[PDB]
Amino acid sequence: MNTVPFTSAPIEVTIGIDQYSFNVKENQPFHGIKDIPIGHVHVIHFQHADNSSMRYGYWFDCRMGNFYIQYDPKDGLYKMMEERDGAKFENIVHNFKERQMMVSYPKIDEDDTWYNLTEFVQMDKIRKIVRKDENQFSYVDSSMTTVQENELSDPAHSLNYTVINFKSREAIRPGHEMEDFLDKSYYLNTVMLQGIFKNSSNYFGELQFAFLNAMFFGNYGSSLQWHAMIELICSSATVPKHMLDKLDEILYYQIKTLPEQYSDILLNERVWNICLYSSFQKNSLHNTEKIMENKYPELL
Amino acid sequence: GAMNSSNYAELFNNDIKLFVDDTNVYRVTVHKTFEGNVATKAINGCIFTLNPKTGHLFLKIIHTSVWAGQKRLSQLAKWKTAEEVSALVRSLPKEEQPKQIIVTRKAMLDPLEVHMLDFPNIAIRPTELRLPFSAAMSIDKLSDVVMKATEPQMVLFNIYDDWLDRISSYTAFSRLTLLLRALKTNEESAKMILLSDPTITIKSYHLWPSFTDEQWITIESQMRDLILTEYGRKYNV
Ligand SMILES: O=C(O)c1ccoc1CN1CCOCC1
């Protein structure tokens, strides 16, 4: 188990760690999060008590370094940093643990939720979507726009998701206009899977990361990408059976985790009704259809 | 965006534009079969592609062979229309290509946009005008060429005859839309109005009677009376 210590908590803040959250008071003796499960990416996220504007946070993998959080009073935020002095870092953690100034990652043993939401998410792929090569962790916030959003403005601070556009030359073979527009199989399988992503695991990793950024930061462009990657599969008549079965699992756990009260802002009615009731794959997503119908029947 | 009564003069400016109407592309008769079921039989159709400034009409005849062995024909017909309009644009010299294509039915927007991806600077637009171009097949010389066709064919016409020698495009389009609305509302009476005077004939190279400026006023009045008469019969007014 790994640990992200905090130097201090000078401003009152709601802190998220993956799907968990807790409140910290101004100048409370809070010095970090322990017992973080090795083997998965994680996200540590923030929303300031005095200004709910800008949710922001950091994706990290404790196998890649020793990371801590320290508040910067000039830039006004909690910043992730890497400590290269290993013995210094272990000494800091041990003291804070002995004084019980850390919260424990509150994972129940039966509970596979985080694995289910991050199964295909790799830190190396996150670092290509979020470009800042001098750090091993990745900053995301509520306002960051995507490359696609920009095209339609600082590129160093963008989310470089793979651009999906159903009415584009990339999606439509000259001479196959009706075919490719009504059945997106060639765009999914040849262009996206064989060409850009190389395999379905990388495609699902990006879909999963997009959902997580939409949910944890309210990042609109990420929500757009998540729905586009769903619709591309559902609008394809020829999809490998293992991908359809995995998609049903991925989406089921995403719908299960979504806050009930954010459904109005995180779910696109058109996309979900098309996908579940009109598309080629309308009968291939049984688990997702069942949870959607029982949890959000109004949207449908 | 959408073309309506607010931006109507835009139709007659010097930016090349085409209206595309697909209502006569896929045409059928419905009949009972020997077993008492119902079947359709396709008949030849056409794409109505019109430059409203110059009157040039690109009538692409859609021969029934293009439907053979195809499914979902009403859907295919939109895509075939878009394919053919795309081909027409590519066939035209650059300086004759349209800057805007206005579709009379919103279901044509996606098929045309997809077929015109190679032309990102040609705007594809709907309209809020209710245009009577479905009545094109009530113009005898157009219906004749469509029905006689034995293979796909493009035929070029000027739907305004020589009216632009004496009136503006705006007025010519107004006359055309009134004539077509009348033919749509009561075809038999509209044709009777147009042919009632045997001394006024249709030139071999024209679609409509060689009426004088004063006769066109009378004809236009009679067309408006027809439309109003039919409105009263319909709604019992
Ligand atoms: O041509 C004229 O001098 C004229 C004078 C008033 O109206 C017309 C119409 N022209 C051309 C159309 O066919 C009738 C004859």
Ranges of each domain in chain B:
9-163, 164-237
Here the tokens at position B33 are 């079969």
Contact in structure between A217 and A262 (CB atoms under 8 Å): no
Residue B217 buriedness (CB in 10 A; 0-12 / 13-18 / 19+): exposed
Element spanning B87, H or E = helix B73-91
Contact B117 A181 (CB under 8 A): no
Residues B62, B45: contact at Cβ < 8 Å? yes
- The encoded tokens of residue B119 equal 């032309």
Spatial neighbors of B84 by CB under 8 A, at least 6 apart, are B47, B60, B62
CA neighbor of A30 nearest in space, from A92, A100, A91? A100
- Asked if A152 is an interface residue toward chain B (Cβ–Cβ < 8 A), one would say no
| Cα–Cα distance measured from residue B155 to residue B56, given in angstroms and rounded to the nearest whole number | 11
Task: Output the CA torsion sign for B65, B71, B73, B79.
Answer: negative
- Tokens 């949870």 sit on residue: A291
Compute CA distances B11 → A164, B14, B144, B195, B220, whole Å: 35, 9, 29, 30, 21
Q: Which helix (H) or strand (E) holds B41?
A: strand B38-43
* A45 φ/ψ angles, rounded to the nearest 5 degrees: -130, 160
Pick the CATH number of A116-299 from 2.60.40.1220, 3.40.50.720, 1.25.40.550, 1.10.260.40: 1.25.40.550
Q: What kind of experiment solved this structure?
A: X-ray
Q: Choose the mutation target among B117, B118, B119, B122 for the interface with A, i.e. most A CBs under 10 Å.
A: B117
Residue type, B189: S
Q: Three-state secondary structure along B133-163?
A: HHHHHHCHHHHHHHHHCCCCEEEEEECCCCH
Name the CATH superfamily, with its identifier, for domain B164-237. Answer: Prp8 RNase H domain, fingers region (1.20.80.40)
Distance CA B180, CA B188 (A): 12
Q: What is the CA radius of gyration of chain B?
A: 19
Distance, in Å, from the CA atom of B159 to the CA atom of B3, rounded to the nearest integer, reads 21
Residue A287 near residue A252, CB atoms below 8 Å: yes
Q: Return d(Cα A15, Cα A4) in angstroms, integer.
A: 12
d(CA A203, CA A224): 15
Strand pairing partners for A78?
A71
Using most ligand atoms within 8 A of CB, pick from B194, B212, B219 the residue to mutate for ligand 1: B212
For the B9-163 domain, the top CATH level (class) is: alpha beta
Pairing of strands B17-21, B100-103: parallel
Structure tokens at B153: 């064919």
Q: Which phi and psi angles does A3 have, rounded to 5°? A: -140, 135
- For residues B53 and B16, give the distance between their C-alpha atoms in angstroms, rounded to a whole number: 8
Q: Rounded to whole angstroms, how far apart are CA atoms B185 and A36?
A: 76
CB atoms within 10 A of CB A191: 18
Helix H or strand E encompassing A128: helix A123-129
Q: What is the dihedral of CA A144, A147, A149, A150, to 10 degrees?
A: 90
* C-alpha span between A293 and A295 (Å, rounded): 6
- Resolution, expressed in angstroms to one decimal: 1.5
